[PDB]
């Protein structure tokens, strides 16, 4: 029945490549796409051609999540193509004007709240500004926990939030294969990527706790092999999860101990945690602080505008 192929698509991010998966079944399904770049598109087209296919032959595209490396080429697919993912992808992937306005307001406010020096901010650009690597295309179909995608009958949709709010993985009960997305990556942690609140969202799960719960769920599943969004397959999910949970705990303690010595802004903690990477890249830190603020381990001296932890 199905033949699954991994295609490695170049992306202009530190991870260098994204894994996309072509499933040759009764119809042709692609899982994830690559960024909205000429380079990504050319690579996808070339690798499809070597398999004897053109973009127009793909009848279903499934998104594991809304990050640009996974959805960015959505516009290229034929008008007949089913586009399937978590429902919350929709505002991101359509670049809904109201969503974009909210996104821009959130990040401006966040920059101030976290005390990011203006010189480091995307500002103009960065060899790259923002949102520019994403698509402008709607879903045709939404999926949630336990759902089946018509073109992938042996798989079940599992909600795997944490890395992103829109994150899903595809589980094949027959042989325990998971098309994981970015929920569990072998070589690097895939910790929560900060997002704006959705319109109407009063609250979301504590993101780090959600990520950890997703990890624990995966560890309890009977998974033989994770086909990951980046890097090599994961064959020992239990082992990897245990390691990641241990590392997360250590980092949380490191943050807690940093703050005991000197109360700090998020940016200041970031510079302590990532003394080399903070100029080249910008993550996390807030995830750890927010995790500790939940769990009532750390207080925020709100007042100034630049929050003090
Ligand atoms: Mg059959
Ligand atoms: Mg192949
Ligand atoms: Mg291949
Ligand atoms: Mg390959
Ligand atoms: Mg390849
Ligand atoms: Mg054929
Ligand atoms: Mg055929
Ligand atoms: Mg045939
Ligand atoms: Mg090839
Ligand atoms: Mg190939
Ligand atoms: Mg090639
Ligand atoms: Mg083509
Ligand atoms: Mg082609
Ligand atoms: Mg074509
Ligand atoms: Mg395009
Ligand atoms: Mg469909
Ligand atoms: Mg999705
Ligand atoms: Mg919507
Ligand atoms: Mg929308
Ligand atoms: Mg978009
Ligand atoms: Mg708005
Ligand atoms: Mg702060
Ligand atoms: Mg600061
Ligand atoms: Mg921006
Ligand atoms: Mg982008
Ligand atoms: Mg465009
Ligand atoms: Mg348009
Ligand atoms: Mg559309
Ligand atoms: Mg639907
Ligand atoms: Mg269903
Ligand atoms: Mg399915
Ligand atoms: Mg379907
Ligand atoms: Mg179908
Ligand atoms: Mg995210
Ligand atoms: Mg989430
Ligand atoms: Mg299944
Ligand atoms: Mg099963
Ligand atoms: Mg996860
Ligand atoms: Mg990971
Ligand atoms: Mg991996
Ligand atoms: Mg991890
Ligand atoms: Mg982040
Ligand atoms: Mg975001
Ligand atoms: Mg995001
Ligand atoms: Mg929304
Ligand atoms: Mg929280
Ligand atoms: Mg759990
Ligand atoms: Mg498992
Ligand atoms: Mg389960
Ligand atoms: Mg790897
Ligand atoms: Mg491998
Ligand atoms: Mg492994
Ligand atoms: Mg301690
Ligand atoms: Mg500092
Ligand atoms: Mg560093
Ligand atoms: Mg975060
Ligand atoms: Mg609480
Ligand atoms: Mg607040
Ligand atoms: Zn991602
Ligand atoms: Zn990714």
Q: Residue 76 is part of a domain; what is its CATH number?
A: 3.60.15.10
Place of tokens 């406010």: 109
Query: Nearest ligand to the C-alpha of residue 52?
Result: 13
Sequence-distant (≥ 6) Cβ neighbours of residue 241 within 8 angstroms: 184, 215, 216, 218, 219
Instruction: Give the chain's domain count.
Output: 1
- Cβ contact 180:229 at 8 Å: yes
CA angle 89, 221, 66 (to 5 degrees): 10
Identify whether 91 is part of a domain.
yes
Sequence-distant (≥ 6) Cβ neighbours of residue 251 within 8 angstroms: 273, 288
286-293 and 266-273 helices, crossing angle to 10°: 120
Q: Give dist(CA 258, CA 255) in Å, integer.
A: 5
Identify whether 35 is part of a domain.
yes
Identify whether 136 is part of a domain.
yes
CA–centroid distance, 106 to ligand 20, in Å, is: 16
Identify whether 276 is part of a domain.
no
User: What's this structure's resolution in Å?
Assistant: 1.5
- Percent helix, strand, coil in the chain, to 5, is 35, 15, 50
Identify whether 302 is part of a domain.
no
CA–centroid distance, 67 to ligand 44, in Å, is: 6
Identify whether 228 is part of a domain.
yes
CA–centroid distance, 7 to ligand 4, in Å, is: 4
From residue 196, alpha-carbon distances to 106, 202, 299 in Å are 6, 12, 22
Identify whether 99 is part of a domain.
yes
CA–centroid distance, 286 to ligand 46, in Å, is: 9
Strand partners, 158: 169
CA–centroid distance, 221 to ligand 33, in Å, is: 27
The bridge status of strand 82-85 relative to strand 141-142 is: parallel
Tally Cβ neighbours within 10 Å of residue 120.
14
Identify whether 266 is part of a domain.
no
Coil/strand/helix, residue 171: strand
Experimentally determined by: X-ray
Range of the domain at 163: 3-240
Sequence-distant (≥ 6) Cβ neighbours of residue 150 within 8 angstroms: 60, 82
């Amino acid at each position: 029945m199905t033949v699954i192929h991994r295609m490695e698509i170049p992306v202009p991010f530190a991870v260098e490549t994204v894994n996309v998966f072509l499933v040759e079944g009764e119809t042709l399904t692609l899982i994830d796409t690559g960024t909205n770049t000429k380079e990504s598109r050319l690579a996808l087209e070339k690798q499809l051609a070597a398999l004897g296919y053109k973009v127009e032959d793909i009848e279903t595209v499934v998104l594991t999540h809304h990050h640009a490396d996974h959805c960015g080429l959505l516009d290229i697919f034929s008008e007949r193509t089913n586009i399937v993912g978590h429902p919350w992808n929709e505002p991101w992937i359509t670049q809904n004007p109201q969503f974009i306005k909210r996104y821009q307001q959130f990040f401006l406010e966040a920059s101030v709240q976290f005390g990011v020096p203006e010189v480091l901010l995307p500002q103009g650009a960065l060899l790259t500004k923002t949102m520019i690597y994403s698509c402008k295309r709607s879903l045709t179909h939404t999926v949630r926990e336990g759902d089946r995608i018509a073109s992938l009958p042996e798989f079940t949709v599992i909600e795997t939030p944490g890395h992103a709010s829109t994150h899903i993985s595809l589980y094949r009960e027959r042989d325990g294969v998971l098309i994981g997305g970015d929920a569990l990556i072998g070589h690097i942690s895939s910790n929560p990527i900060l997002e704006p609140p959705y319109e109407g969202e009063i609250e979301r799960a504590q993101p780090m706790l959600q990520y950890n719960e997703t990890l624990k769920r995966l560890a309890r599943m009977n998974i033989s092999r994770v086909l990951s969004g980046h890097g090599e397959d994961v064959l020992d999910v239990v082992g990897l999860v245990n390691e990641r949970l241990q590392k997360q705990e250590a980092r949380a303690f490191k943050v807690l101990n940093l703050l005991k010595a000197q109360p700090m802004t998020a940016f200041e903690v970031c510079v302590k945690l990532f003394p080399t990477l903070y100029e080249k890249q910008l993550p996390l830190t807030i995830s750890e602080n927010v995790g500790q603020l939940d769990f009532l381990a750390y207080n925020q001296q709100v007042m100034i505008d630049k929050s003090s932890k």
